[PDB]
Design a protein around this motif. Structure first.
Motif, short mmCIF file in Angstrom:
data_model
loop_
_atom_site.label_atom_id
_atom_site.label_comp_id
_atom_site.label_asym_id
_atom_site.label_seq_id
_atom_site.Cartn_x
_atom_site.Cartn_y
_atom_site.Cartn_z
N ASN A 240 15.85 -32.49 16.54
CA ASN A 240 15.99 -32.62 18.08
C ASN A 240 16.40 -31.35 18.85
O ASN A 240 15.51 -30.80 19.76
N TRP B 31 9.38 -35.43 17.69
CA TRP B 31 10.32 -35.56 18.79
C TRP B 31 10.04 -35.11 20.18
O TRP B 31 10.52 -34.63 21.08
N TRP C 57 19.90 -33.12 9.73
CA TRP C 57 18.48 -32.76 9.82
C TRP C 57 17.84 -33.27 11.20
O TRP C 57 17.07 -32.52 11.79
N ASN C 58 18.01 -34.66 11.57
CA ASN C 58 17.78 -35.28 12.71
C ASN C 58 18.29 -34.42 13.99
O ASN C 58 17.37 -34.14 15.06
N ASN C 59 19.46 -34.06 13.91
CA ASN C 59 20.20 -33.26 15.07
C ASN C 59 19.57 -31.87 15.05
O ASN C 59 19.00 -31.58 16.31
N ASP D 163 17.42 -43.44 4.20
CA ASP D 163 17.60 -42.36 5.13
C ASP D 163 17.84 -41.01 4.34
O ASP D 163 17.02 -39.91 4.70
N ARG E 290 19.99 -36.74 6.04
CA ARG E 290 19.15 -37.21 6.96
C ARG E 290 19.64 -37.00 8.44
O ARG E 290 18.96 -36.49 9.18
N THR E 291 20.91 -37.14 8.78
CA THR E 291 21.63 -36.91 10.22
C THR E 291 21.40 -35.78 10.77
O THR E 291 21.05 -35.40 11.97
N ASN F 68 13.79 -40.59 17.83
CA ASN F 68 13.87 -40.23 16.53
C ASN F 68 15.16 -39.99 15.76
O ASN F 68 15.16 -39.45 14.54
N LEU F 69 16.30 -39.90 16.51
CA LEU F 69 17.65 -39.56 15.94
C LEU F 69 18.12 -40.80 15.42
O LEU F 69 17.83 -42.01 15.46
N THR F 70 18.97 -40.46 14.29
CA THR F 70 19.65 -41.56 13.53
C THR F 70 21.21 -41.39 13.52
O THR F 70 21.50 -40.57 13.67
N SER G 206 7.05 -36.24 11.41
CA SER G 206 8.03 -36.56 12.62
C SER G 206 7.67 -35.78 13.90
O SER G 206 7.06 -34.98 13.90
#
Ligand code: NAG
Ligand code: NAG
Ligand code: NAG
Ligand code: NAG
Ligand code: NAG
Ligand code: NAG
Ligand code: NAG
Ligand code: NAG
Ligand code: NAG
Ligand code: NAG
Ligand code: NAG
Ligand code: NAG
Ligand code: NAG
Ligand code: NAG
Ligand code: NAG
Ligand code: NAG
Ligand code: NAG
Lengths: 142, 454, 142, 454, 142, 454
Positions: free
Chosen positions: F296, F348, F291-293, F366, F288-289, F355-357, F346
């Motif tokens: 972004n 951003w 991927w969020n980075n 997550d 999850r993390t 939207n970051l985790t 999603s």
């Protein structure tokens, strides 16, 4: 002068050699304007037949003949230019003939023809006579 | 001292027997036909090929012994085979037919036979127009008509898209082989030549398939030439080179129908549909005066061993194959067969002038008008196998062909010294291809040269 | 002397090179008497099998090897004749050996074999040492 | 200064593994047979190939590791396949047959089965002669006989026109590869050689297919040679090189019939017709004295680890395949199989002289006479697939073959040091092809040479 | 320096020619480690596809191009080494340009490009100008 | 005097358009798989190919115009065709089937249809496992299910022995052609480059067939790159180069059965047998993390003409072909199709941070867990013809793939300046192959050079 410039001559024939050589080896330009990829302008089929595969094949055979020419130039050490002599004398094989007249009234062809197995007879000696018995130039002082 | 010397790039010309290549001009590749019976992906003609005229030179030629004809016909056959490969097959179109002779000898009878479809079991019925030459009446069981080409071999389409029109074609030599061409007009096949003009790529020609004649070919100028591989040999065809050319009108007034019917999974057969309006027969009108002048020219040119300058006689072929007893050619894909029964009935033996015609006082029936035939199937180079099917041209077939040559056969079944009889001979199809190959001679080029030099 | 004339020699082997070269490259004559177009005398079939297509194919591979030989001669500027030197010294790579004895008792083969990766080691230097660092002849006055 | 120096055209000989080419003498191309089992459009042997004998030279050979055998057999197979391609098929000749055992074990029973014709439905009946080896009696339903070759794979003709006679064949090397040939007579397969004689084209050979023997082959002179790839290995075949040669008479007195019957559209099957006169069996008469001399020679040559100079024993093959338990060859197209049960029953262990025979006082039954067999079908190189059919020779089959080699297999199912038993081994068919390849060694030629020079 | 060593240079580019030539013609080593006979280590199929037949085919086409290069070297008598002049002057065809600056600020490419049909225009003259009108060296006394 | 001078071996670089060759490292030929979907008898990579970095140089590239993709895909197709050639056929496996939906949408229903045997008349019955994607329910006569691939074209096996795993492959240039490769990271497709590094053999790649994504490919570093052949063109796919990579778990827990059943004379079909234990469905768990980075990063990288730095929106593909609406790849021979419905939901736009985790405070749900599909048949390069059959892998299918790229398609059926919508596009399969070809450019090398010299 692709092939003319010599009706019955040895000197003029010898001087028009480069013109004949350049005119004869000019087919690569023709092969360049093939424009022949897949179609002429709108549509077309494959059509590649034994005819054209053999067009390229006859191309290959002749260019291989020129390659064998280059190999012979290499064997005798004769690849520098069209001007290259032999360390082999003309056997009295050929019949008594004036040289200058062999030139002017043999068209290269009459002297060749009745030296013909003589011309080839003088041919094989060159490799082991110009390369095997290979001497330099003249012997002079300074 | 005759010190042997070696030389390179020497001018040398020797008897070549090698392959020649295809060349088709820029106008060729601008024809935009995927293939109009003739064009390939082959090399186009170069913008400016060199034809060095060689003078004060000599070269002996023999067109009948020239191997050019062989490779020419072979590559023609290879190209035709490879072109037939993509065409759809007509094996199920082979099925029996039943033709009704509606137009009543007119050989125009609508025929309606079974034409199969994409699925194995879903078959419908169609009818097209067939001539009396595609099918024959059975007299053994006399139930219907059968395609002659269909009870002897397979049947396949003739690539209707590929129209059989003549295109310019250029033959080039490989690198180190030249084609020495005579520049002489009375230069016969097996003769020497002084107007040697070395030619890298032979001059563009128009290979239109024809029998006993020439269409749109090389014109021989400044005389009428009558050669033959053996003049004494009566069987030997007598090749003639007319000085001038005549205006042919192998033109069919009646239109054509095309019925593009899908037969297979992507295969369609262009059946000849019905013809709009009164269906008449093809005609032909040809000029009279120029023909008389050329005939006087030949008869004057025929006097070879003429007894006292009058032995010239012509007769129609006794008979034989359709392709050798008449003039056949291709024009718009339809294989035209304009007949030649108007030339065998004339005799300029005593007076070439007695048979001559004045243009100003032309007669009533002077304009040569004779019936002109066509065809759908054909066997190239007299080869018995899988045949083809010419599609319709869907329009009034207009053919304009010209004249520049002729083939005769001396009559052997007659007196030897009484009267010279020439009859049309169409037996040899390579005499047509060699008529224009009496100057070209593939010539080898060898730079090696020995020579006693001081 | 196609390949003999040298049992254990470097000088005699060097002097019989042209004879060996001419004897070895004589197969073109054999290819000339093919007489092999379609039949021997009366009848025949095609029979052209992988055997003979590969006869021509082995011909092609060897003649390509000779072509690569000519290309190497061109790269080093060494195509004049069999007599052509190198601007590269024999590395002390090879083991201490008398040269003349390497000649007379190496048959060219013993010196080659234990110079073998040395002989090839001395090989690659020639292109950029005889052509890259390419000098003329001697430096003398007159 | 050991200035490195480069040299070209150097004498160099390296281990070549390359293709060899076919050569067949002028007498070959004058054989005029379209192909007598062996000839092609391949290059003929040159009038005078150079075989430079190299002396004071050394060369190590290994015939069993020589790759020549591989390309030889492969090109043999390629040529046989390509020759079979034009032959007509016999798939419908596959049909069941019904053979009557007229000549009563004689294996000559006229068989009459159905042979089909050109049209699909028009079939007649024919009868030919078949042996007991082309068909088998069915014991499952025992209704008739079946061709064994026909229930296992396809059937096709063996090109009866192409007679399976031996012809001279010459293998040439490419340009830059030589074949270094030993000139030694006691030169074994994996040995060095000083009589190196570089050979551009290997000497002409006579590849006659044979099992456990040699026919018309290279004779090894000045001794009897008995080599084997592994002598200790009893399974290893024991190749023997006899000094002299014997006169074989694999000659069938009875004539042959040929019944050229058209089967397909242009395909004909040469059925064996009836034989005129009393039909006897093939015989064979072979000489006695020279064979005894050669046998003493081998037994003297066999003494390898013989215990006190007497351990030589021979036995018949226990059994196995017909092609490996007996001597088979081709002679006039008929696959002759003269048996070899007269050689296993002799023993020159103690006295080579005790078993020797005087020519002047030859015994009554001295002339070796044994039964000789033939065959119609064959599978080359033990390949299970589409078979062939040997046509008749229509005449008394006279075969004259000679002897120059032998193959044995040491017996492993016996004592190791008690008595040496050799049995006929015909397992490896390449031992036949390598017997004459113990001197030839394709040798590479490299002109490049480095050398420190001052 | 296979192809670098010359960003915008005529002299440095000329001096790194042998390095570029040796680096470029090094693919024969890669063809040597084919290891590619029939299998990689345990099993394999034929797999010989138009891809690899055409790998060898592109090999053949490029090596034929190099062969045509050698033939041109032979035609001009220019096969000795990379150092070989012409008996033909640069036509005023090219535009007025300083030579040394054409060298240092043409990267060989700018002078070539706007001499480009000029460079080829000067090309064909060489055969019948260096071989046809073929002179020796200088004319001096000793 | 500007004496023209000629030079050889000159440094010259020109636009090459030529063939490239195959290269596979030593580790390749040590893979020991007769062919794991990819390897040949082709040339291996050389031990140390030269990649001369060229600096103070410039080179313009265009990956979309680079012809490398074309030969690559063509040779891929040639290799796949030639690999399919040895595989056994499944034409009789085409027969109707009757599938029982035992596992009840689960698409796991044992199907038992007729599978024929060696003899013509001896046929038994078998059952395998088939999915709902190999056969369809008939609603015209609704008697049983039919393989869709079997009512449209032929059926054949997919060489189960040849596993479809990715292998390293190396493309080499011919002698005189180089591949100039840009060494730049923000280097787009049609751009110049100064980090030219001439490359004889292009760097080893991992051609894993995938749709709308990349698996085990070249990673673009030091930034996120979002290229497209036309950004304005909404239909133009939007190629993206992620900076980092994610850990995929396309792993099926359930085992596979293989039922090696001989069908033909030497042909066997690996039917999917029953599965031991409770048969569940394949799953997938993704991080999850990171991927969020990366998201972004892209959304920050997406801001191309973003209105006030917030226009980034993503949506699921409206629909279409299965191969273009979802992510498909091959992994262990089983054609994995892990879905991608977790990325379209999603946004951003305003805050990449909103939207970051946080990894430390990761949510409960997550870890991305979504359903993952597989397949047995496939049509490469969207080619409708003879299909194949993937055998079982007989084991828990574990696929570990990584992420280094992405393909989007801008939404045209929306506002032009209101909000930028990107949707997954998998239409073009060559965008996958060109993503890594934006630096390589086949470059010609010409030694000839003219130059006025004094
Ligand atoms: C051997 C030969 O041909 N000799 C002739 C000679 O007879 C003639 O008088 C002369 C006139 O130019 O031309 C020479 O070539
Ligand atoms: C009989 C003869 O040689 N006629 C040729 C003529 O065909 C050619 O058109 C002309 C060109 O100048 O040269 C003449 O000599
Ligand atoms: C009498 C007559 O019909 N003459 C025509 C002529 O006017 C026309 O120019 C020519 C075209 O080839 O065809 C002829 O048939
Ligand atoms: C109209 C005319 O001139 N006819 C003549 C005739 O008078 C003469 O008897 C004959 C002899 O060849 O030639 C013709
Ligand atoms: C050679 C020849 O046939 N010439 C004739 C001429 O005799 C005749 O007077 C004229 C009338 O049209 O036609 C032309
Ligand atoms: C002028 C005219 O009437 N032309 C048509 C022609 O286009 C058509 O192909 C043909 C069909 O039979 O009928 C006619
Ligand atoms: C290195 C070598 O082989 N040296 C030997 C040497 O031992 C021998 O005494 C001599 C006799 O000729 O021959 C030389 O070749
Ligand atoms: C053992 C040996 O080498 N024997 C050979 C012999 O085979 C050959 O026929 C002869 C020719 O002179 O030369 C001998 O040396
Ligand atoms: C006893 C006997 O029949 N001897 C003959 C012999 O006379 C003949 O020369 C030879 C031909 O190979 O065949 C043998 O069988
Ligand atoms: C006939 C003859 O000479 N027989 C002898 C025998 O006397 C001797 O005991 C034996 C020993 O090897 O060899 C054998
Ligand atoms: C080596 C050999 O076997 N020689 C024998 C000899 O012992 C015997 O006396 C003679 C009688 O024919 O035959 C031979
Ligand atoms: C001498 C003699 O009788 N010869 C014939 C032979 O030509 C024929 O082929 C054979 C047929 O079985 O019968 C026998
Ligand atoms: C034709 C050209 O490129 N000229 C430039 C020149 O403008 C510049 O001042 C100089 C600085 O080194 O570099 C030269 O190459
Ligand atoms: C933007 C750019 O050119 N980046 C490259 C980088 O990709 C490469 O790994 C590195 C090697 O030293 O050189 C840099 O210049
Ligand atoms: C929550 C979870 O199951 N995480 C696992 C992770 O521990 C494992 O290392 C990875 C392998 O790709 O697969 C993930 O699904
Ligand atoms: C560029 C980007 O998305 N950076 C984010 C950061 O804003 C956020 O605070 C962090 C929490 O895990 O994750 C990362
Ligand atoms: C750990 C385990 O249970 N493995 C097996 C696997 O080897 C087998 O192929 C499969 C068949 O469905 O069943 C499961």
């Amino acid at each position: 002068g692709f092939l003319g410039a010599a009706g019955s001559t040895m000197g003029a024939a010898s001087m028009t050699l480069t013109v004949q050589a350049r005119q004869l080896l000019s087919g690569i330009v023709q092969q360049q304007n093939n424009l022949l990829r897949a179609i002429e302008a709108q549509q077309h089929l494959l059509q590649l037949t034994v005819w054209g595969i053999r067009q390229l094949q006859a191309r290959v055979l002749a260019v291989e003949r020129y390659l064998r020419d280059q190999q012979l130039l290499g064997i005798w050490g004769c690849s520098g230019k069209l001007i290259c002599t032999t360390a082999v004398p003309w056997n009295a094989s050929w019949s008594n003939k004036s040289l200058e007249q062999i030139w002017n009234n043999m068209t290269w062809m009459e002297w060749d023809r009745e030296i013909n197995n003589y011309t080839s007879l003088i041919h094989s000696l060159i490799e082991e006579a110009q390369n095997q018995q290979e001497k330099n130039e003249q012997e002079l002082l300074e | 001292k005759l010190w042997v010397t070696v030389y390179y790039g020497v001018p040398v010309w020797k008897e070549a027997t090698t392959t020649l290549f295809c060349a088709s001009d820029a106008k060729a590749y601008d024809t935009e036909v995927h293939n109009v019976w003739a064009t390939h992906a082959c090399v186009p003609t170069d913008p400016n090929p060199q034809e060095v005229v060689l003078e004060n030179v000599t070269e002996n030629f023999n067109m009948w012994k020239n191997n050019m004809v062989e490779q020419m016909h072979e590559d023609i056959i290879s190209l035709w085979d490879q072109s037939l490969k993509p065409c759809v097959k007509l094996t199920p179109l082979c099925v029996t037919l039943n033709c009704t002779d509606l137009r009543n000898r007119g050989e125009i009878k609508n025929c309606s036979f079974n034409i199969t479809t994409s699925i194995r079991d879903k078959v419908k019925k169609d009818y097209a127009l067939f001539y009396r030459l595609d099918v024959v009446p059975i007299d053994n069981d006399n139930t219907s008509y059968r395609l002659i080409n269909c009870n002897t071999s397979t049947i396949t389409q003739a690539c209707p898209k590929v129209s059989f029109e003549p295109i310019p074609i250029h033959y080039c030599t490989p690198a180190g082989f030249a084609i020495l061409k005579c520049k002489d007009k009375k230069f016969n096949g097996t003769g020497p030549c002084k107007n040697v003009s070395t030619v890298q790529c032979t001059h563009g020609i128009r290979p239109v398939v024809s029998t006993q004649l020439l269409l749109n070919g090389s014109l021989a100028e400044e005389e009428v030439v009558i050669r033959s591989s053996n003049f004494t040999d009566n069987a030997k065809n007598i090749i003639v080179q007319l000085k001038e050319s005549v205006e042919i009108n192998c033109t069919r007034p009646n239109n054509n129908t095309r019925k593009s019917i899908h037969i297979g999974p992507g295969r369609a057969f262009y059946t000849t549909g019905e013809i709009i309006g009164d269906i008449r027969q093809a005609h032909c009108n040809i000029s009279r005066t120029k023909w008389n002048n050329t005939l006087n020219q030949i008869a004057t040119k025929l006097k070879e061993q003429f007894g006292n300058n009058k032995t010239i006689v012509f007769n129609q072929s006794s008979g034989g194959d359709p392709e050798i007893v008449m003039h056949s050619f291709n024009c718009g894909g339809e294989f035209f067969y304009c007949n030649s029964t108007q030339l065998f009935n004339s005799t300029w033996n005593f007076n070439g002038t007695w048979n001559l015609t004045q243009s100003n006082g032309t007669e009533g029936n002077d304009t040569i008008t004779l019936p002109c035939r066509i065809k759908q199937i054909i066997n190239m180079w007299q080869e018995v196998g899988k045949a083809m099917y010419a599609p319709p041209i869907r329009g009034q077939i207009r053919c304009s062909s010209n004249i520049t040559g002729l083939i005769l056969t001396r009559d052997g079944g007659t007196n030897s010294s009484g009267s010279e009889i020439f009859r049309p001979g169409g037996g040899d199809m390579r005499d047509n291809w060699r008529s224009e190959l009496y100057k070209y001679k593939v010539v080898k080029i060898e730079p090696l040269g020995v020579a006693p030099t001081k």
